[PDB]
Amino acid sequence: LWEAALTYEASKRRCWERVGCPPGHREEPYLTEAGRDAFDKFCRLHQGELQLLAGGVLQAPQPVLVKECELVKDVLNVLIGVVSATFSLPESISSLLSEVAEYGT
Amino acid sequence: MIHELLLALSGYPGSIFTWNKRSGLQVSQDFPFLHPSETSVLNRLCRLGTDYIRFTEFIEQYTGGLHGIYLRAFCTGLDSVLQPYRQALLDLEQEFLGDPHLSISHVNYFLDQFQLLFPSVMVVVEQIKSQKIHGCQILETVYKHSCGGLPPVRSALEKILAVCHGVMYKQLSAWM
Amino acid sequence: KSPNVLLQNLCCRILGRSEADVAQQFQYAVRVIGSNFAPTVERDEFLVAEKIKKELIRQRREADAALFSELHRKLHSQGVLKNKWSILYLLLSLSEDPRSYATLFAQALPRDAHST
Amino acid sequence: AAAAAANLNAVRETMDVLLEISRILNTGLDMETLSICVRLCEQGINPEALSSVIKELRKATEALK
Amino acid sequence: PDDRSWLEHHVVHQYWTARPSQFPHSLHLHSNLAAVWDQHLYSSDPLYVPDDRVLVTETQVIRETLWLLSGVKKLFIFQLIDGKVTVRNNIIVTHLTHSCLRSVLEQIAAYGQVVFRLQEFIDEVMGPFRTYQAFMWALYKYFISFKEELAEIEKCIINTTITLAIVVDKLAPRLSQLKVLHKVFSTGVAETRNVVRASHLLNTLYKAILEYDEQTVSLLFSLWVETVRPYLQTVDEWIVHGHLWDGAREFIIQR
Amino acid sequence: ITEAALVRDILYVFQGIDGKNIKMNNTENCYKVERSLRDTAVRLSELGWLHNKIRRYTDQRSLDRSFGLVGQSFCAALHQELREYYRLLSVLHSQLQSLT
């Protein structure tokens, strides 16, 4: 089993600080290249910071969840003539959303 | 340590292998981490780097009384012989990443052939400076050392000689 | 695994055939591996190292005879093998020459002069 | 965990070193058969016993070809 | 913790945001060398004198230097003196005891100044001459291709064994080409009328190609055509339209 | 005295580098020690004593061009023979991290 597992891939990541075959941990990308997860955490932290800095008088309506395709179907529906999920007769989505909502209105 | 020497040997001396033009890569530093006689092994090794450092400055100043297109072929040839000195410095540090158990002597035997190249091309770089030769007769004085007697400097001078001929073949192609 | 199924895996490695087909040879193998199984003589890796050197001198190849030295050092640098003597003896016995005798050449101690 | 893969690395190196040894003396065996042989040599075995077996089993496959 | 934990893990934060680096090590001189030498210095009785530098890792330096070399300015590393980047003597790596580092980082700082001044010059044309505008355009046309190769290397960092001597050697045909524009710009900063300020530059460019009459000659040629372009435009016009027009005098002939 | 101290100097006196407690005051006579293990050492040090002669001779004769192409070829042959000895001495170093 051990010799059966032994045919596995060995690391090609070495260091001159960790010497003697370090396994690797990675090159640690920054907060412009480590998102799609830290992006969401960064948005969440920023929203919490703004709500603290105001006093709870700000009230985000969760401009994330729903994701994209559901949102895209909703804005396709407002152009048909039937009402959307926030209007009826990332936080920058509100600015994009108002502009495409008033069209179908 | 076996990366620090690989820069002290290259172009970046350090405070353990401090540079002087009256003694290249001086090590005189007392070591509780090294044997008393290890300094002499280092002393024999440091001559190899001293030559390379002198060579790179000589190439660096171009482009005093030496001037012409002839030094714009000679120094370019002097880079090409140092090119297997760049690849063979790359190889050692590639080995040291996985196996750190490899001693000084591995560098010693592996780079033993360029402790034969270097003293015999050092006389070529000094020869053109002590008496000023920057004419078309640089080719003769490399052409009499191309006979050689030591095979590394016998094949190194061929590389430079071809480049000098290549510059001579443009004057004699416009003219003709 | 256990050794008894592992000898079958050896019988399936070298012969292509199934193990329900060839069972006479597996029977002949089980007699010789059994009852002479574990080490009973003194192990020494240095003599086997010098005999790998003597085999590579028998080819008149001195470069790999010096490469074998750093490989033989590395085997002890890691130290994750129980019997270093066995695999070098094994690999030395299974050598093939691409392109003598041993009644003048002295082997290891048997522990038949020494109590088991 | 992690050290249980670091020892797997420390044997993964040795399996290359014995492979280089095996190829410079040139057995007619490859890596997979060699894994059976190293598995055998871990429990303790006589090479005088095992090698003879290998010399017999190779004379069983070119007798049915 | 819970967001700082995620930050500390995936993003770095250790010299440039205050968090003292506890980077694991295998010690044992080949990567413990700064500590070995400091302990030796103390045991020989300095006397005392604790040296304070904040301990960056190895690869971070190399990445930061790439971003410095490509042509964008204002990084955390490299103390600037007037707009001249110099080596930072407030950081240290686990070996090399900060001396070999002080040499080689000085080499890359020497390249960083040459690229800093040229990019600042290009920026100060956007905030005419009809020859400066083509000149910065040629310089820029070089810079975009140069910056692209640096950026793909930096991308390939995240995708192995990285140390100095590979990325230094790989960028030899780039730092060689960088040295030439330093010489070309040194006579472009030595200056009354715009026609002589154009012509004295352009004839230096026209003569420097025949001096080496490779990689250098293509560099000089690619700068040459994009600066002789406005004069060809004006002489073409001078023929075919029968009139002469410049934007405030590109000629020495008073017609 | 510990033997590991001796082995370290021994591995250097082959090159022509004096150890810490192995020196050669009279250059003609072989390396002199500065109970049986003490007796063995001189027989071990003879090889380095020969290596000194061989190295020092090819040091001078390789740089001489008033000695001709032949003679420099002798030097070349010698340098190539000298190169392999250090490859051996490398292995002898590496086996530290008994060793008799």
Swiss-Prot record, chain B:
Please list the tissues where expression of this protein has been recorded: Ubiquitously expressed.
Q: In which domain of life is the source organism classified?
A: Eukaryota
Q: Where in the cell is it found?
A: Cytoplasm, Cytoskeleton, Microtubule organizing center, Centrosome
Provide the leader sequence positions.
none
- Please state which protein family the record places this protein in: Belongs to the TUBGCP family.
Assembly and interaction partners:
Component of the gamma-tubulin ring complex (gTuRC) consisting of TUBGCP2, TUBGCP3, TUBGCP4, TUBGCP5 and TUBGCP6 and gamma-tubulin TUBG1 or TUBG2. TUBGCP2, TUBGCP3, TUBGCP4, TUBGCP5 and TUBGCP6 assemble in a 5:5:2:1:1 stoichiometry; each is associated with a gamma-tubulin, thereby arranging 14 gamma-tubulins in a helical manner. Gamma-tubulin at the first position is blocked by TUBGCP3 at the last position, allowing 13 protafilaments to grow into a microtubule.
Disease affiliated with this protein: Microcephaly and chorioretinopathy, autosomal recessive, 3: A disorder characterized by congenital microcephaly and chorioretinal dysplasia associated with poor vision and nystagmus. Variable ocular anomalies include microphthalmia, retinal folding, retinal detachment, optic nerve hypoplasia, absence of retinal vessels, round areas of chorioretinal atrophy, and attenuated electroretinogram. Most patients have mild developmental delay and mild learning difficulties.
Name of the protein this chain belongs to: Gamma-tubulin complex component 4
Originating species: Homo sapiens (Human)
Q: Which gene encodes it?
A: TUBGCP4
Full protein stretch here: 1 to 191 of 667
Swiss-Prot record, chain C:
Q: Which residues carry this modification: Phosphoserine?
A: S100
Q: In which tissues is it expressed?
A: Ubiquitously expressed.
Where is the protein situated, by its record's location annotation? Cytoplasm, Cytoskeleton, Microtubule organizing center, Centrosome
Q: Where is the signal peptide?
A: none
- Spell out the subunit comment: Component of the gamma-tubulin ring complex (gTuRC) consisting of TUBGCP2, TUBGCP3, TUBGCP4, TUBGCP5 and TUBGCP6 and gamma-tubulin TUBG1 or TUBG2. TUBGCP2, TUBGCP3, TUBGCP4, TUBGCP5 and TUBGCP6 assemble in a 5:5:2:1:1 stoichiometry; each is associated with a gamma-tubulin, thereby arranging 14 gamma-tubulins in a helical manner. Gamma-tubulin at the first position is blocked by TUBGCP3 at the last position, allowing 13 protafilaments to grow into a microtubule.
Function text: Component of the gamma-tubulin ring complex (gTuRC) which mediates microtubule nucleation. The gTuRC regulates the minus-end nucleation of alpha-beta tubulin heterodimers that grow into microtubule protafilaments, a critical step in centrosome duplication and spindle formation.
Tell me its family.
Belongs to the TUBGCP family.
Protein name from the UniProt record: Gamma-tubulin complex component 3
Q: Could you tell me which species this protein originates from?
A: Homo sapiens (Human)
Gene coding for it: TUBGCP3
Q: Which residues of the full protein are shown?
A: 7 to 129 of 907
From Swiss-Prot, chain D:
Q: Which residues form a coiled coil?
A: none
Q: Which GO terms describe its biological process?
A: gamma-tubulin complex localization; microtubule nucleation by interphase microtubule organizing center; mitotic spindle assembly
| Keywords of this entry | Acetylation, Cytoplasm, Cytoskeleton
Residues of the signal peptide: none
Q: Give the intrachain disulfide bonds.
A: none
UniProt subcellular location? Cytoplasm, Cytoskeleton, Microtubule organizing center, Centrosome; Cytoplasm, Cytoskeleton, Spindle
Please classify the protein's predominant subcellular localization into one broad category: cytoplasm
The organism's superkingdom is given as: Eukaryota
* One Gene Ontology cellular component annotation held by this UniProt entry: cytosol
Known role? Required for the recruitment and the assembly of the gamma-tubulin ring complex (gTuRC) at the centrosome. The gTuRC regulates the minus-end nucleation of alpha-beta tubulin heterodimers that grow into microtubule protafilaments, a critical step in centrosome duplication and spindle formation.
Summary of subunit composition and partner proteins = Associates with the gamma-tubulin ring complex (gTuRC) consisting of TUBGCP2, TUBGCP3, TUBGCP4, TUBGCP5 and TUBGCP6 and gamma-tubulin TUBG1 or TUBG2; within the complex, interacts with TUBGCP3 and TUBGCP6 to form a luminal bridge with actin that stabilizes the initial structure during complex assembly. Interacts with TUBG1.
**UniProt family annotation:** Belongs to the MOZART1 family.
Q: What is this protein called?
A: Mitotic-spindle organizing protein 1
Q: Which residues of the full protein are shown?
A: 11 to 75 of 82
UniProtKB/Swiss-Prot annotation, chain E:
State the Gene Ontology BP annotations. cytoplasmic microtubule organization; meiotic cell cycle; microtubule nucleation; mitotic cell cycle; spindle assembly
Q: Where in the cell is it found?
A: Cytoplasm, Cytoskeleton, Microtubule organizing center, Centrosome
> In what tissue types does this protein appear?
Widely expressed, with highest levels in heart and skeletal muscle and moderate levels in brain.
> Molecular function (GO) terms listed?
gamma-tubulin binding; microtubule binding
Coiled-coil annotated spans = none
Q: Which UniProt keywords apply?
A: Cytoplasm, Cytoskeleton, Microtubule
- Quote the cellular component terms of the Gene Ontology held in the record: centrosome; ciliary basal body; cilium; cytosol; gamma-tubulin complex; gamma-tubulin ring complex; microtubule; spindle pole
Principal location = cytoplasm
Disulfide bond annotation, renumbered to this chain: none
Key word Cytoplasm present: yes
Q: How does it assemble?
A: Component of the gamma-tubulin ring complex (gTuRC) consisting of TUBGCP2, TUBGCP3, TUBGCP4, TUBGCP5 and TUBGCP6 and gamma-tubulin TUBG1 or TUBG2. TUBGCP2, TUBGCP3, TUBGCP4, TUBGCP5 and TUBGCP6 assemble in a 5:5:2:1:1 stoichiometry; each is associated with a gamma-tubulin, thereby arranging 14 gamma-tubulins in a helical manner. Gamma-tubulin at the first position is blocked by TUBGCP3 at the last position, allowing 13 protafilaments to grow into a microtubule.
- Describe the function of this protein: Component of the gamma-tubulin ring complex (gTuRC) which mediates microtubule nucleation. The gTuRC regulates the minus-end nucleation of alpha-beta tubulin heterodimers that grow into microtubule protafilaments, a critical step in centrosome duplication and spindle formation.
